[PDB]
Amino acid sequence: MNVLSVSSEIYPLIKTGGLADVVGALPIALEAHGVRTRTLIPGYPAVKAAVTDPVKCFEFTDLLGEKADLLEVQHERLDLLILDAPAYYERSGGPYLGQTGKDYPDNWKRFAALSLAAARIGAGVLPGWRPDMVHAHDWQAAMTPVYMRYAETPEIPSLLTIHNIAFQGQFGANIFSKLALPAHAFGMEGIEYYNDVSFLKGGLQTATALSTVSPSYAEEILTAEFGMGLEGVIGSRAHVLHGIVNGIDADVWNPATDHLIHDNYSAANLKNRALNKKAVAEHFRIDDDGSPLFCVISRLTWQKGIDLMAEAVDEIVSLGGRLVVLGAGDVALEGALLAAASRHHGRVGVAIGYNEPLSHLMQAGCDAIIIPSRFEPCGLTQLYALRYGCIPVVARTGGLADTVIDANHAALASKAATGVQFSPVTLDGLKQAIRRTVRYYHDPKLWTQMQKLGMKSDVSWEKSAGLYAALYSQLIS
Distances (CA, A) of 475 to 3, 6, 115, 133, 135: 11, 17, 20, 8, 11
In 297-355, which residue ranges form alpha helices assigned H by DSSP?
Answer: 306-310, 313-318, 331-342
Cβ atoms of 422 and 240 closer than 8 Å: no
Element (H, E) at 38: strand 36-42
> Torsion over CA of 208, 213, 216 and 222, rounded to 10 degrees?
-50
CA 334 to chain centre: 24
223 and 285 within one domain: no
Work out how many domains the chain is built from and give that number.
2
Query: φ, ψ for residue 254 (rounded to 5)?
Result: -145, 110
On whether both 160 and 280 belong to a single domain, the answer is no
Angle at 426 between CA 421 and CA 427, to 5 degrees: 100
CA distance 425 to 86: 48
Number of Cβ within 10 Å of residue 135's Cβ equals: 31
Helix (H, G, I), strand (E, B) or coil at 354: coil
Euclidean distance between CA atoms 93 and 4, whole angstroms: 26
- Rounded Cα distance between 51 and 336, Å, is 46
The DSSP call for residue 244 is -
Spatial contact of 129 and 152, defined as CB atoms under 8 Å apart:
no
Find out whether 182 and 147 touch, Cβ atoms under 8 Å: no
Residues 50, 186 within the same domain: yes
Regarding whether 368 and 347 lie in a shared domain, the answer is: yes
3 state DSSP class of 394: strand
Half-sphere exposure of 232 (CA within 13 A, CB side): 6
Which structural domain, as residue segments, surrounds residue 279? 249-457
CATH number of the domain where residue 324 is located: 3.40.50.2000
Q: What is the three-class DSSP state of 252?
A: coil
- Specify whether 281 is located in the same domain as 164: no
DSSP-assigned beta bridge partners for residue 300: 329
Q: Both 106 and 217 in a single domain?
A: yes
- Burial of residue 54 (number of CB atoms within 10 Å: 0-12, 13-18, 19+): buried
Find how far residue 437's CA is from the centre of its chain: 27
Method used experimentally:
X-ray
Q: Annotated binding site for ADP-alpha-D-glucose, which residues?
A: 15
Please enumerate, as own/partner, the contacts of 310-313 that have beta carbons within 8 Å and a separation of 24 or more: 310/336, 310/337, 310/340, 311/427, 312/370, 312/427, 312/430, 312/431, 312/434, 313/337, 313/340, 313/341, 313/344, 313/348
Could you give the 3-state DSSP secondary structure of residue 414? Answer: coil
Contacts of 339 (CB under 8 A, 6+ apart): none
d(C-alpha 317, C-alpha 437), whole Å: 13
CA dist list (Å): 360 to 41, 275, 281:
32, 14, 14
Specify whether the CB–CB gap between 9 and 41 falls below 8 A. yes
Q: SS3 for 439? A: helix
Residue positions in the annotated binding site? 15
> Alpha-carbon distance 199 to 204, whole Å?
9
Identify whether residues 136 and 256 lie together within a single domain. Answer: no
Identity at 115, one-letter amino acid code: S
My answer on whether 465 and 422 are in the same domain is no
Same domain, 242 and 265: no
Q: Evaluate whether 266 touches 256 at the Cβ level (below 8 Å).
A: yes
Specify whether 465 is located in the same domain as 446. Answer: no
Specify whether the backbone of 329 is left (phi greater than 0), alpha (psi in -120 to 50) or beta.
left
Give the residue from 85, 121, 79, 126 showing the smallest Cα distance to 106. Answer: 85
Is there a single domain that holds both residue 240 and residue 291? no
Same domain, 235 and 365: no
N- to C-terminal Cα distance for the chain?
12
Residues 6+ apart with CB under 8 A from 104: 91, 96, 97, 98, 110
C-alpha torsion angle, residues 306, 254, 356, 288 (rounded to 10): 70
Q: How far apart are CA 193 and CA 242, in angstroms?
A: 23
Residues 324, 366 contacting (CB under 8 angstroms):
yes
The number of beta carbons lying within 10 Å of the beta carbon of residue 477 is 6
